[PDB]
RNA sequence: AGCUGCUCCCUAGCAUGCUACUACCG
RNA sequence: GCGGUAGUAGCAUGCUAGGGAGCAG
């Protein structure tokens, strides 16, 4: 438990139905859950009615029933609504300031990241909210990429040429050089270690990692990672130095790096370097040039 | 002064135990012997000997960042 | 009857995680340990009654710290305490007098 | 619990009775004020009790959930709190023999086995560069853990025995510098 | 209760009573209306306060029924577990040596302590130090319990494999030193 | 990871009992 | 005016049950 993102006050609640379960305060979470369709919150215990084999998962209908949260037809004689006053019952109910403008986080959550306004809000929002938008992007692409088919090769036609077979219910995604496949070799116990490959139509042309034998029944799947939360923002609140700090200039002038001497001082007194460089303008020659600006 | 060294010995053996040292029988046996001998000592001149011996075990591994934890 | 003071102090100092090393979460451990150590206040040796008085002072400190946390983090106050009896010695004295109130 | 609606009723009739006890009036209008107050001290003495108990119920539930949260979060940080506490206690202990080996390990000279206590038994220590060798080694004596040892052998990283006389400032960049000194306690 | 027969009677009784009070007809009208709304609240008392013990008792019964069903499922689960264990441990002892030594008994009864001694196919030896190793499990084969066993695999207290050429008198101080020898019965 | 005995604290339920207020009746 | 029965609120004793903890053999 800890402080929330939008509000920066300590909280103990989540959106259960939302994507990446962020921290949200009492009124904070209330706005997020009443303005849109996320209606499942997680405290130290989840907000569900413990009635044997009951169903409900809403937040505004469940009530307090002593030690636990119960359903309306399940609730004891006298109760205390968990979601009232403009707040949801949770930790630190007093020190919560909340917010009014919640269209940002609501849109970022309910969005599918399919169109241009998606990214418009993804950048033009709060920097922490844009980190959250980044993680939501990664989670969405991971969830949508494993949702495609499995490449179940059955034939052996040639080298760099085979035949594909895919299962029912899942279409076959664009066999592009953009997204790399991933395969595993079958055995009686498990199936592992073929690597990441790239397929396209041929007969099926495959781009293999390293030369080996093509067996029968190996599947090639667009596997996903286990993406983790972020800590630091995109960049630092920026600065111009008064001195050449932690740095001192060189003593000589370099022939290949004489065209960039005016570029040495200009960033030695700040953090970032806003580059506008077209492909092939000495794009990387300064990466070795500014490197020997001071070899220490 | 004896109480402090005994408490430090207890904490030191806890740190060694949570660094997966009991997966080597000989090392764990020696560490247990030193820890049990410090707790039964009566003069505070052999307790420091055994404390040097027992801390060398942690200093010889590479699971702790000495420069970071010793920021003073 | 009275116990060995080092047994009580050792029970106070060495534990099995969470069960102590955070006093505010249990507190009743020290109430039981002070019940066990009350009769030391009637010993001729003056270093023996200090154990009971140390336990009472620590109980008061723990209660104050828990209330301070609670008010500094929600804004909440326990309405009526009925807890000052735990750092006054009548509660512990009544456990050794022949009139059963178990 | 005076912020409840029914309080306004209970005072109202009570105020009437005040006027009554100020007036000295007949018998029936006092029955009025003994028939519309006992309905007030009954319609209010029920609302102002269950809510008072509910306040403490909410308080105790909040304390229980806070206890659970803090206990859950305490046993997820043992591996860092324990090391911090260990080094705080070591710093407070203030011993010369312990400070020596702690500072040597901070610079880079660390042992390779348990430090022995008997005057017999072998010690092996690593040396990362020449500065530590210079302020630690002197001739054939080794000062370590506030004790004195005599050198028996020096080697380099490729397990090739190096004689002691050649170790110096100018020949330094010719040896694999992670030296391993073997010594025996005086 | 909100829609039980007493509610309509009580509500209409007090509605007419207070309409006549707004009329304010008599002095016995007040007494009569108050008696009606004393006996009609004496209907909304039994039917709305004691009607609620029925529901509570029904819920007691329902929770007890749920508990009994769960306790009945757990019994079947543990029964299946126990009989699976028995049958899986059965499939190892039905050899031909056991039949031999049971058909050599005069009643079919034998002491249990001799069943592993004369029928087990694999032996495990735990050795504390070098002299005991030199007295018991020396070489590649040894004799014990009127049988002859051949060695395969030796490990230490860390469960790591040791070769038979490392167990000497000079290399002894470098081993984790309970040693566990596994041997097979030679025909 | 055991068998007992004693003690402290919190919650819920029921019975009993006490006390107070409204209603019916005698 | 009193007694009884039917109601509502508060208090007291013990009895069962659930949970946490301490000591002794
Ligand atoms: Zn959400
Ligand atoms: Zn339900």
Curated annotation (Swiss-Prot), chain A:
Domain CV ZBD, chain residue ranges per copy: 1-112
UniProt-reported outcome of changing residue 255 to Y: In strain: Epsilon/B.1.427/B.1.429
Phenotype when changing residue 87 to H: In strain: Iota/B.1.526
Coiled coil ranges: none
Residues reported in the UniProt entry to bind Zn(2+) 12: 15, 18, 32, 38
Impact when changing residue 76 to L: In strain: Delta/B.1.617.2
Positions with a binding annotation for Zn(2+) 13: 49, 54, 71, 74
Sequence positions that bind Zn(2+) 11: 4, 7, 25, 28
LRR repeat ranges per the UniProt record: 223-243
Annotated catalysed reactions: ATP + H2O = ADP + phosphate + H(+)
Location(s), subcellular: Host endoplasmic reticulum-Golgi intermediate compartment
Function statement: Plays a role in viral RNA synthesis. Multi-functional protein with a zinc-binding domain in N-terminus displaying RNA and DNA duplex-unwinding activities with 5' to 3' polarity. Activity of helicase is dependent on magnesium. Binds to host TBK1 and inhibits TBK1 phosphorylation; the interaction with TBK1 decreases IRF3 phosphorylation, which leads to reduced IFN-beta production.
UniProt protein name: Helicase nsp13
UniProtKB/Swiss-Prot annotation, chain B:
Localization, UniProt: Host cytoplasm, Host perinuclear region; Host cytoplasm; Host endoplasmic reticulum
Domain of life the protein comes from: Viruses
Domain RdRp Nsp7 cofactor: 1-72
Chain's role: Plays a role in viral RNA synthesis. Forms a hexadecamer with nsp8 (8 subunits of each) that may participate in viral replication by acting as a primase. Alternatively, may synthesize substantially longer products than oligonucleotide primers.
Assembly notes: Interacts with nsp8 and nsp12 to form the replication-transcription complex (RTC): nsp12, nsp7, two subunits of nsp8, and up to two subunits of nsp13. Eight copies of nsp7 and eight copies of nsp8 assemble to form a heterohexadecamer dsRNA-encircling ring structure.
Name by which UniProt lists this protein: Non-structural protein 7
Shown part of the complete sequence: 3861 to 3932 of 4405
Curated annotation (Swiss-Prot), chain D:
Protein location: Host cytoplasm, Host perinuclear region; Host cytoplasm; Host endoplasmic reticulum
Placement of LRR repeats on the sequence: 30-57
Region ranges (Disordered): 1-73
Domain of life, per lineage: Viruses
Start and end residues of each RdRp Nsp8 cofactor domain: 1-186
Subunit organization: Interacts with nsp7, nsp13 and nsp12 to form the replication-transcription complex (RTC): nsp12, nsp7, two subunits of nsp8, and up to two subunits of nsp13. Eight copies of nsp7 and eight copies of nsp8 assemble to form a heterohexadecamer dsRNA-encircling ring structure.
Function, as annotated: Plays a role in viral RNA synthesis. Forms a hexadecamer with nsp7 (8 subunits of each) that may participate in viral replication by acting as a primase. Alternatively, may synthesize substantially longer products than oligonucleotide primers. Interacts with ribosome signal recognition particle RNA (SRP). Together with NSP9, suppress protein integration into the cell membrane, thereby disrupting host immune defenses.
Protein name as it appears in the record: Non-structural protein 8
Full-protein positions shown: 3948 to 4133 of 7096
């Amino acid at each position: 438990v800890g402080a929330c993102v939008l509000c920066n006050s300590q909280t103990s609640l989540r959106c259960g139905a939302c994507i990446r379960r962020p921290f949200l305060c009492c009124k904070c979470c209330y706005d997020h859950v009443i303005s849109t369709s996320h209606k499942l919150v997680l405290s130290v215990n989840p907000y569900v009615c413990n009635a044997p084999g009951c169903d409900v998962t809403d937040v505004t209908q469940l009530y307090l029933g002593g030690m636990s949260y119960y359903c309306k037809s399940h609730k004891p004689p006298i109760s205390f609504p968990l979601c009232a006053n403009g707040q949801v019952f949770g930790l630190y109910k007093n020190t919560c300031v909340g917010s009014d403008n919640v269209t940002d986080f609501n849109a970022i959550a309910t969005c599918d990241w399919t169109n241009a306004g998606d990214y418009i809000l993804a950048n033009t929002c709060t920097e922490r909210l844009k980190l959250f938008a980044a993680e939501t992007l990664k989670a969405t692409e991971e969830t949508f990429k494993l949702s495609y088919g499995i490449a179940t090769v059955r034939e052996v036609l040639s080298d760099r040429e085979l035949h594909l077979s895919w299962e029912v219910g899942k279409p076959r995604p664009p066999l592009n050089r953009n997204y790399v496949f991933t395969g595993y070799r079958v055995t009686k116990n498990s199936k592992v270690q073929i690597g990441e490959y790239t397929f396209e139509k041929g007969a099926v042309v495959y781009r293999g990692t390293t030369t080996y034998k093509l067996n029968v029944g190996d599947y090639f799947v667009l596997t996903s990672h286990t993406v983790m939360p972020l800590s630091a923002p995109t960049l630092v609140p920026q600065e111009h130095y008064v001195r050449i700090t932690g740095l001192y200039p060189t003593l000589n002038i370099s022939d290949e790096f004489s065209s960039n001497v005016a570029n040495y001082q200009k960033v030695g007194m700040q953090k970032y370097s806003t580059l506008q460089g077209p492909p092939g303008t000495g794009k990387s020659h300064f990466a070795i040039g500014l490197a020997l600006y001071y070899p220490s | 002064k004896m109480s402090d060294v005994k408490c430090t010995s207890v904490v030191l053996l806890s740190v060694l135990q949570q660094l997966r040292v009991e997966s080597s029988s000989k090392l764990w046996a020696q560490c247990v012997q030193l820890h049990n001998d410090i707790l039964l000592a009566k003069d505070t001149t052999e307790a420091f000997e055994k404390m040097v011996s027992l801390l060398s075990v942690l200093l010889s591994m590479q699971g702790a960042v000495d420069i970071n934890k010793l920021c003073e | 009857p009275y116990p060995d003071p080092s047994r009580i102090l050792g029970a106070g100092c060495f534990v099995d995680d969470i069960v102590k090393t955070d006093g505010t979460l249990m507190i009743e451990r020290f109430v039981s340990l002070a019940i066990d150590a009350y009769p030391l206040t009637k010993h001729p040796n003056q270093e023996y009654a200090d154990v009971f008085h140390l336990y009472l002072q620590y109980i008061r400190k723990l209660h104050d710290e828990l209330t301070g946390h609670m008010l500094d983090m929600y804004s909440v106050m326990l309405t009526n305490d009925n807890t000052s009896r735990y750092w006054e010695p009548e509660f512990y004295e009544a456990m050794y007098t022949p009139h059963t109130v178990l | 619990f005076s912020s409840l609606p029914s309080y306004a009723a209970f005072a109202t009739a009570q105020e009437a009775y005040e006027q009554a006890v100020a007036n000295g009036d007949s018998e029936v209008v006092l029955k009025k004020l003994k028939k519309s107050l006992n309905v007030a001290k009954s319609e209010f003495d029920r609302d102002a009790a269950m809510q008072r108990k509910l306040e403490k119920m909410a308080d105790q539930a909040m304390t229980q959930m806070y206890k659970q949260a803090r206990s859950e979060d305490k046993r997820a940080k043992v591996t860092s709190a324990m090391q911090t506490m260990l080094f705080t206690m070591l710093r407070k202990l203030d011993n010369d023999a312990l400070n020596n080996i702690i500072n040597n390990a901070r610079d880079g000279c660390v042992p390779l086995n348990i430090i022995p206590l008997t005057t017999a038994a072998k010690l092996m220590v690593v040396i990362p560069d020449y500065n530590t060798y210079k302020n630690t080694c002197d001739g054939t004596t080794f000062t370590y853990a506030s004790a004195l040892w005599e050198i028996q052998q020096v080697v380099d990283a490729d397990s090739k025995i190096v004689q002691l006389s050649e170790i110096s400032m100018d020949n330094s960049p010719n040896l694999a510098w992670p030296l391993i000194v073997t010594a025996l306690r005086a």
